[PDB]
Amino acid sequence: RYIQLNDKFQFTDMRGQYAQSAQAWLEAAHKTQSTTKRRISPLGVGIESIQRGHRRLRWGSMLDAMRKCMRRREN
């Protein structure tokens, strides 16, 4: 996420151990994203379009579970 948001990243600028392995992983991820439309790199979404897994919209599935728990207890 930091590399994505910086936007001033350079591959050869990086120094330290694990440099080559992470470089290879990033190159493979970019190649996979180019070839396959599926997204691997993290992406940011505004507060308007809250998606399925977020904490804001747990309550729907949770209330479904709550209703089934009530059903079982009433049975």
């Binding site: 904490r55 747990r58 479904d64 089934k68």
Partner: protein
């Protein structure tokens, strides 16, 4: 239910606690089948805990379990 009905002020703090501890008490009380759909819908790490380790057989339908692991 009270928090989501707006009867008293709604605070995310301790609401995360309510959610997580409800899941905890549900899994302790052996409500695995109910938690299956919740894990599938939200995405979690207890999907392995309940779906395979206590629900569906491992020898069958191996591929989804392998992908999850």
């Amino acid at each position: 239910i009270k928090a989501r009905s707006g009867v008293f002020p709604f605070g995310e703090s301790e609401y995360s606690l309510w959610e997580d501890h409800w899941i905890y008490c549900a899994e302790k009380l052996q409500h695995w089948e109910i938690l299956t759909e919740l894990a599938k819908h939200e995405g979690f790490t207890d999907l392995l805990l309940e779906c395979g380790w206590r629900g569906a057989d491992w020898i069958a339908d191996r591929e989804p379990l392998e992908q999850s692991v």
